[PDB]
Amino acid sequence: TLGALEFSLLYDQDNSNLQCTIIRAKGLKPMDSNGLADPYVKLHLLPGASKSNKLRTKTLRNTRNPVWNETLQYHGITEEDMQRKTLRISVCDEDKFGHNEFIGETRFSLKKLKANQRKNFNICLERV
Numbered sequence: 001t002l003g004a005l006e007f008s009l010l011y012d013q014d015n016s017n018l019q020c021t022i023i024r025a026k027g028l029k030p031m032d033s034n035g036l037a038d039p040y041v042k043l044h045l046l047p048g049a050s051k052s053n054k055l056r057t058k059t060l061r062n063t064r065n066p067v068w069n070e071t072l073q074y075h076g077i078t079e080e081d082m083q084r085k086t087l088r089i090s091v092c093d094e095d096k097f098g099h100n101e102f103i104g105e106t107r108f109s110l111k112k113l114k115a116n117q118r119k120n121f122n123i124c125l126e127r128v
């Protein structure tokens with residue numbers, strides 16, 4: 001009951017480009033009463049040297065069913081990276097002071113992606 005997340009991945013291998021389209025989420029769970037329903041999505045490539053491994057969607061306002069409809073792009077992504085790394089996608093609510101509450105996540109092993117073949121996801125978030 002944490003919510004479901006919709007997204008699409010495409011590895012444009014010849015251009016060393018991993019395109020992560022964060023589409024929508026449905027039924028995000030209300031948590032902290034002092035929090036806001038201001039959801040956003042964070043991407044992390046693991047393992048990663050921090051900083052550069054992170055991308056982030058826009059933050060929406062007052063919604064438990066956000067539609068970001070946004071593509072985040074990792075450039076300089078090689079086959080060594082696709083074989084070694086995991087993409088962690090986490091959904092958080094931004095609070096009144098710019099901090100946040102973690103709702104849930106999903107992970108995907110990049111070696112399961114075939115070059116140039118888009119893969120569409122509709123998964124339920126989990127806590128780990």
Ligand SMILES: O=P(O)(O)O[C@@H]1[C@H](O)[C@H](O)[C@@H](OP(=O)(O)O)[C@H](OP(=O)(O)O)[C@H]1O
Nearest residue numbers: 040042043054055056090092094098099100
């Ligand atoms: O530099 P950016 O573009 O802001 O990207 C931030 C980065 O991905 C952090 O890992 C994340 O921290 P948390 O996972 O702890 O939230 C932060 O969330 P934030 O919006 O709360 O700072 C993101 O905004």
